[PDB]
Amino acid sequence: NITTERAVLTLNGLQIKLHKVVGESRDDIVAKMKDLAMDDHKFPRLPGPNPVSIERKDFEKLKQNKYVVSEKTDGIRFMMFFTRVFGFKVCTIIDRAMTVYLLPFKNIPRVLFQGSIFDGELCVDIVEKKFAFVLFDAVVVSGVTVSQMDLASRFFAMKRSLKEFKNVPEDPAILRYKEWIPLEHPTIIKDHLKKANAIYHTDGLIIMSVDEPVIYGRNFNLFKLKPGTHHTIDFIIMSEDGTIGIFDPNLRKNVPVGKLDGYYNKGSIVECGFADGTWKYIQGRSDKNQANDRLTYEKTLLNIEENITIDELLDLF
């Protein structure tokens, strides 16, 4: 049987109960996805790109090359994988740490189960108070590797397969497709962004190449933009006098970086924002035992400093 263990995900004040796939079953689903995705990376990862923050150096490239734009949905990143395990046709969603849950739909066409890997976000529909799964892109559809073709071909393949699918009320998520708008369409972009934000929780926008094949991992040509300067960092309290530190993952030692005004419990993790030269407390995190690493900190400072805004960005066009 597929050895499962139950789990509940909470997003935006709502929860979803799912069977987390465990042990050798988890191991086999992951190894199956690695083969279908033909990823020979020596480390377990999803066959999908992680965006990079937009930098002012990128503005040239944005204006030479072709790109599409969409809202950055705020929810959980999942690769959705249709396969067959021990004879049964299975729909799974895998997250970035390689944790596998079943997410079953009634009406998935049996072709998908020959090997579909679609990329998306599990998220909540504000208007409907139901979960939605929003598909960003496809890697393999019914056994056909679509990853090296251009974005419009990938969506053509994906939409083709699901063309006869209908959701039914008992399905655990509303399957929906990311509408990507061309980066030369500012008024169409703004309007799409306004409609998008009526339905979803968004964290800015994502800008993606119209024609490059799928990258797996950090994709230096997939850009995200946070609205305004609302970057935060999680620091560890290294002193009761609020000395905040940041983790160096290869020393495995926290390094002192600043100091907060107030009394703080050593070893806690505080989410802070930067304002006028110092970091300021926003909330303590009881759910974390580790600060953000140096890399995340260095890059967030650069972004704070550069202060790119969505209106600056959409006015380049």
Per-residue string for binding with ligand GTP, 193-212, x by CB under 6 A?
-------------x------
Per-residue string for binding with ligand GTP, 76-115, x by CB under 6 A?
-x--------------------------------------
| Residue of the chain from 141, 178, 242, 308 that contacts ligand GTP (CB under 6 A) | 178
| Shortest CB 226 distance to ligand GTP, Å | 8
Q: Using CB under 6 A, which residues numbered 218 to 237 contact ligand GTP? A: 222, 224
CA distance 286 to 259: 20
Q: Where are the beta strands (DSSP E) in 210-292?
A: 217-225, 233-237, 244-248, 253-256, 269-275, 278-284
The answer to the question of residue 49 lying near ligand GTP (CB under 6 A) is yes
Please, which residue, 50 or 114, has the CB nearer to ligand GTP?
A: 50
User: Which residues, 6 or more positions from 286, have their beta carbon under 8 angstroms from its beta carbon?
Assistant: 268
User: Which residues, 6 or more positions from 247, have their beta carbon under 8 angstroms from its beta carbon?
Assistant: 236, 253, 254, 255, 290, 291, 292, 293, 294
Stretch that binds ligand GTP, among 66-74, 235-243, 250-258, 259-267 (CB under 6 A): 66-74
CA distance 101 to 19: 6
247-252 CB contacts, 8 Å cutoff, 24+ apart: 247/290, 247/291, 247/292, 247/293, 247/294, 248/293, 248/294, 249/293, 249/294
The answer to the question of residue 136 lying near ligand GTP (CB under 6 A) is yes
| Shortest CB 177 distance to ligand GTP, Å | 11
DSSP tag of 4: E
CB-based contact 269:234 (threshold 8 Å) = yes
| Residue of the chain from 25, 73, 209, 243 that contacts ligand GTP (CB under 6 A) | 73
The answer to the question of residue 72 lying near ligand GTP (CB under 6 A) is yes
The answer to the question of residue 121 lying near ligand GTP (CB under 6 A) is yes
Q: Which residues are catalytically annotated?
A: 72
* Other residues' Cβ atoms within 10 Å of the Cβ of residue 153: 14
| Shortest CB 168 distance to ligand GTP, Å | 26
| Shortest CB 278 distance to ligand GTP, Å | 21
Q: Is the dihedral of CA 21, 26, 28, 33 positive or negative?
A: positive
State the residues that interact with ligand GTP by CB under 6 A.
49-51, 70, 72-73, 77, 121, 136, 178, 206, 222, 224
